[PDB]
Structures are given as structure tokens and as C-alpha cells.
Amino acid sequence: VKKLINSQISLLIGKGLHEFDSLRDPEVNDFRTKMRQFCEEAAAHRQQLGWVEWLQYSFPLQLEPNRALLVNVKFEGSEESFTFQVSTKDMPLALMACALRKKATVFRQQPEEYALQVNGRHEYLYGNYPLCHFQYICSCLHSGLTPHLTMVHSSSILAMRDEQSNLWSLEQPFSIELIEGRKVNAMKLVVQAGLFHGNEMLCKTVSSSEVNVCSEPVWKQRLEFDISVCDLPRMARLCFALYAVVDCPIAWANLMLFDYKDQLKTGERCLYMWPSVLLNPAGTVRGNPNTESAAALVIYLPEVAPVYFPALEKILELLREILERELYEHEKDLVWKMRHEVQEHFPEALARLLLVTKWNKHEDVAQMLYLLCSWPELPVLSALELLDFSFPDCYVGSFAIKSLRKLTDDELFQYLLQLVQVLKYESYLDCELTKFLLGRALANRKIGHFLFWHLRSEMHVPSVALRFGLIMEAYCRGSTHHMKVLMKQGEALSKLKALNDFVKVSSQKTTKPQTKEMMHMCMRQETYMEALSHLQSPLDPSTLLEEVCVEQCTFMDSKMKPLWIMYSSEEAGSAGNVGIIFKNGDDLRQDMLTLQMIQLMDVLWKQEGLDLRMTPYGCLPTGDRTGLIEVVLHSDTIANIQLNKSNMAATAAFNKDALLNWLKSKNPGEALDRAIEEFTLSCAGYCVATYVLGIGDRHSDNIMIRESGQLFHIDFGHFLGNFRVPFILTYDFVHVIQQGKTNNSEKFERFRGYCERAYTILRRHGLLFLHLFALMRAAGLPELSCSKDIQYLKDSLALGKTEEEALKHFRVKFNEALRESW
């Protein structure tokens, strides 16, 4: 049975457990044994939770960042349903009390015993909250529909929980010996090496002597480092680059100077290098797995007669504010000097003092740590800054986690994408961030869900394969049952991959109607109807995908031939009618990041009472150039709409009218006013979002409209300007905002205010976006590579300016944009 489990883990994580053992590695071993234990205790904890507390685990509430409404409730047993009328402001418990009164009357005869399930979803209503606070009740009120809920008893819930059971001395210079390598090339070759503490050099770099493109090379040279060994910080990182010259780069690799048990390393190392685009401080500190084909350096870390990094016991044993909002030589001096008054009166400047501290001088690192050890916890925002590569020290990292522990689950969800990426900065396997993520993942199944996918989706990347593999396994030991649920998912995605391949081939040889029929036949095979049915959506674990409707499934005619999969549910009704899109062929990371930065914008806007009626749909990378996009039903593309086809509703005299007639056809009588508002709100948000993020190549094929009038965007793969993108005002949107009239500054200038509010609210959180993008630098996203990309955001949010200045600046861009509208 322990056999079955292991084999299923291997299947799930896309890597065989045997591959960990074969490495005969203490580090991996300990990571595997310690994290297994950690995750197991979390699961025991889980089995004894109160039923409400379990709900909090399995189905965490989906809350929003007087008036009555109509609701259908029903109990599990019969399909007899009642329909109530209650205030939006009523607690879920108040509604439960109704239901039972209805049952007790019909039946001829305890509200706290229940929770309300949303029909056909993994979603639940409970809590001390007004119905309207619940994302679902909130939604229902917009798209018009009646809320639909089932009364679930606590013993029914407990039954579900039941089923889911399982040192200072050394003063001489530091220096390696460079023995030899065994590479391949084309002219002379040299090595460079530097001692790094994160971004900055701990001393000048030092080079090899020029040797011809010979070998299989050999140097047997000591390379002396212009620094004392007793100075090296805990996280001393040593980095090599090898390139050709008569400048031409070939490979790099790095190692930690201390092992994972604080012991300094000696003596000889073999080093499997990674190929080039010289010094790459930020690359992984673990060798290239393609050991056969990788160029390999041997070096010799000498043995100065075991030494450990002194324990913390020993560590403890051992004009002004004007600048403080890029600082000079004297300016740093004043800081490091006032260093106590910083702990005392400026804790939020912790980081600035860290980037002044003498990392290459042991003494100063001692006093700095002494201060940190009783530094007060900081706010999340500052913590997110602390997690950046500029702060390699593990006592700093440990503090960052400490201050982050207070993140809420929804916050943590909001930033999960960046925290996973920052794993890629870690020097060793057991690290505070991993145990944190895994702990929070094992305490919230939604978080557990997305960590897994974030991890799974990078398994095809050699540089993270082992780290991510080890984590997924640990998690699985933590949640046997969830692992099964995820297999069910990977199994669907494996079929789609094959069905998508068939479609790619087929479409090159025959007409689209014929391929569609042949996709249907393929889908109707048993193995497929079973694999693609009765799963949880990887886009949203709370969305149940029951029966695939073969007849509605299709594919889109664009390049990678994305698959369009419709689903339905008798049990969820119309909101059981959902679709997903399977895309294989493209990189989804870029879109995912863009879509998360928009959802965050929506969130910050909503926190200041501004709802721009956004459409934050799902986008989830699942694997190598693979993942899913959520279908937004009842949409079409501007370009579609603008085809101006006859024998249908929207028949226009002038092309500029087509969009409006369409909205008209979808929104008769009074409903037309709201469509236009919904269109103006979402327009202002998308115009602002595309502007701030440097997103260009917007055109009528990548903009969509919902029947509600809501505008939104698809297919982003270009941002932070990577072609200074002008702000954009499309005449035909303008035409809709202005309700069809040639002039309408009353409507047009409301629209402007929307943009300006949205613009200035985001400015107030500029720092949140910069910290988030800074962590995303760990991703290797071609368009998020360096400073100029970050600068792009600095320039778009005018963060250094006064809110007067920035707004007026923004006002020219905008005006400049209108004048571009014909």
C-alpha cells in the first residue's frame, strides 16, 4: 500500500522517487525525512479539527474585499426546495433558521448545526458575515440570478473529513585552487571568479590566465581572494564564468562556501556548468543535472587544518533623515553610525541599514545581527522587500518569514506566485520559506492546490526540478487524499495533451468541421469520458467539472489550436455550465503574471470603494508550455462584433455603430443604461491597467466584451513596454461611453475621473507592485530581466513625484491619447 502511494506520488509530481535516492545525498535525505515528519503532524492535526475548522481548511470562504433578495435552499436528502426572501445584510445563520422552519412545517416537525453549500461547487456559506459580503451572493446580485444553496449538516461534513484520512581564527586570504575542466569549443579561454553576498561583490573579482581553446583544460592555480576567511559571511556564494577571447561566453556555475550544516567546505569539487546567453551571482548553487553533456570544473576548497559558522550565542556574545525616503559614501557612514537610533526610531528602514552594512567585514556583520535579534517585526510590505535577492543573509530571511507569518490566507494567495519564485533564490533545501509555504499549504487546501500547480508547472526546468519535486512529495505525505484529487486532474491534462496533438495534426490535413467530429469521436471513447469527467478545476478548486459536453467542445483556429472544453452539471445548474481552454504550445507565465497584477489592481481599487467591473478570469500554467485559461461565457471579441454581418440583430449603417447595436441587442429597454456603465467602468480599469503595465499591441482581436457590457483583455505576452507605450483611447470605446453621441463630455469626463482615481489609487501602492515585481525577477521571464523593466513601472506610476505632479503628467498622456482618437 505504501508501494501504491509512492508510485502515485511519482506519477503526480512527474518524477520518480527513485531518482532522489540514486543521488546518495545527505541534504536531500534530511530534507525528505524532516519535511515528511513535519507534513505528517500537520495531517494528524487536520483529522481532529472541529467541523467548522475543517470547512475553513477544505472550503475557505470567498469574501468580498437594506435590500431583499430571492434565494433557493434545500437539504441533501430530497430534491424538494424552498424559496425564501431575505435581506442582503442577513447572516447565513438567519437564512438557515428559515429553511428549518420550512422543513419543520412541511415535515410536521438547530441552525448552528449547518453550513450552506453553493449548489454544484466546493463553496460554502457560513461565518459572521452579511450575505452580500460573500463573493457568490455578491456575484448573483450582478448577473441577476437567484442564489442556490444546500443545507449541509455537520455530521455530513465530519463524514467528509473522515473519508480524507491518511571560525574567527583564520586571517589569511580566501582562495580556491582551480585544477581543471572538460568542456567543448572554438582563440583563447579564461575563467573569472567573484565572491558574492547577493548582488554586491565582497572583493574585486579575479581572472585566470589565457589558455587556448584546448581541452578538457587544466590550470592547477591557486586563485587568491582579496578578503580574510574569518570575514566570509554565513552565505558566502562563490561564482565562476568561463568564456572565449582573442569576448565570448560559454558557461557559469556557483557554490555556497559553507555546506548546509554551516561547516565550511573542503577540499575538491567537481562542477557541472550551465551554458550562456559573465558573472551570474543569481543563478542556482546546484550543479547541472545533464552531467554527461555538461562541461565540468574541478576546484579545490582548501582545508585550513571541521569549522562551523559560530552559533548565535557567540554572535550576540560579540543632516540626517533628509536622504531617507541611492545614497552617497558619507551618507552610508551616518546610517551605520546612527544604527541604534534606526532600531530605536526608524525600524521601517531596516533594509537601508542592511544595504549599508559591511558584509565583507565579520565585525560589522556581528553588530548588525545583534541589532536584528530584537528588531521589532515589520509590516508585510517591508517583509516582501526583505525577501529580495539583495538580502541573502538567512537571519534576515528568517526575520522576513517571521514578519510575514501574519499574512492572511487571501493575501498569501494574492502573493503566492512571487513567493514560489523566490524559492529559486534559496541556497539550500531546508529553508524557512519552504516550511512556511508547506505549513500554510497544509493548513489551507486552496493554497495547497495552487502551490502544487506552481511547483508542478516548472518540472520541465532542470534548474528547479529537484527542489520543486522534493516539496511536492512532502506535501503529498501531508495530504494523501488531496494527492488523489490532483491525480484525477493531471490525468485529465494528460488526455487533453493527446487530444490537442491529434487536433494539431488533423487540422493540417482536413477541414475544421471534419476535425471537430473526429475530436468528438475521440472524446467519446470510454477512457476519455472517464478521464475528462468528474474533476475539480485546476483554475479553481471550488469549481466542479462534471460531464464534459462533447457536442459543445471544439478548438480555436489559431496556431497552437487551443482546445475548448465545455462542461455541465445537473447539480450546479447554469453555474455548473463552465468551460476551460487547454493551451499547449505557448508560455502562459507572462499572461498569468499580468492577470494577477490586474486582479490585485481590482482588489486595491475595491478597497477604496472603486469597482471598475473587472473580469479577473483564470489562467494557470500546468506544465511545459501548457496550462488552462478559463472560459468567460457570453463574450465575443470586438473584432467579431465588428464583422457587421447581416441577417442578425446588430445591423449597422456605420461601422462605429456595430458595438453599440450589439450591446443594444443584448440589453433592451432600461438594461441598456447599465451595460454602458459596466462598459465605461471596465474600460477605465483596462485602460489604466494596460497603461501602468506597459502592455501594447492591443487591437480588436484581443479585446472582448461580455453581454453585460463588460470589456476585458486576452492574450497578453508583451509588457513593461517590451515591443514607452502611449496611453490608449480607442475611438469606438469612446463612442460607446458617449452613448452614441458625437459629443458627450458629461459621460466622457466621468470616464476620465474613473481613470484618474484608478491611476492614483495604484500610485499609493506603487511600493507593493515594485516589491512584487522585484521578487518576480527570480522567474527568468524574458520581459522581466533587468532594471529598465522595473524602471518602466517607476516611470509609469511617477512614484518620485508629488500627487499633484504625477496626475498632471498623467493628464497630458491622456489628452495626448484622446487627440489620437481620430
The CATH number of 48-166 is 3.10.20.90
Torsion of CA 295, 389, 784, 424, to 10 degrees: 50
Q: How far is the C-alpha of 520 from the C-alpha of 112, rounded, in Å? A: 47
Task: Please name the residues in contact with 610: beta carbons below 8 A apart, sequence gap of 6 or more.
Answer: 754, 757, 758, 761
Residues in the chain: 822
Residue 36, Cβ density class (10 Å: 0-12 exposed, 13-18 middle, ≥19 buried): middle
- What resolution in angstrom units was achieved for this structure? 2.5
CATH number of 634-822: 1.10.1070.11
Q: Is 540 helix (H, G, I), strand (E, B) or coil?
A: strand
The 3 state secondary structure assigned to 628-686 is EEECCCCEEEHHHHCCCCCCCCCCCCCHHHHHHHHHHHHCCCCHHHHHHHHHHHHHHHH
Fold topology of 480-631? 3.30.1010
DSSP run (H or E) holding 811: helix 803-818
* Domain locations along the chain: 1-47+311-479, 48-166, 170-310, 480-631, 634-822
Strand partners, 216: none
CA gap 742, 612 in Å, rounded: 24
Residue 716 DSSP label = -
Domain 1-47+311-479 in CATH 1.25.40.70? The answer is yes
Domain 170-310: which topology?
Immunoglobulin-like (2.60.40)
> Cis link prior to 627 (omega < 30° from 0)?
no
Report the alpha-carbon distance of residue 397 to residue 427 in Å, rounded.
Answer: 11
Q: How is 267-314 classified by DSSP, letter by letter?
A: EEEEEEPEEP----TTS-SS--S-TTTS-EEEEEE------BPPPHHH
* CA 483/CA 478 separation, integer angstroms: 9
User: How far apart are alpha carbons 694 and 719 in whole angstroms?
Assistant: 5
Asked whether this chain's domains 480-631 and 634-822 adopt the same fold, the reply is no
Residue 161 has φ and ψ, to the nearest 5°, of -65, -40
CA 545 – CA 535 distance, rounded (Å)? 5
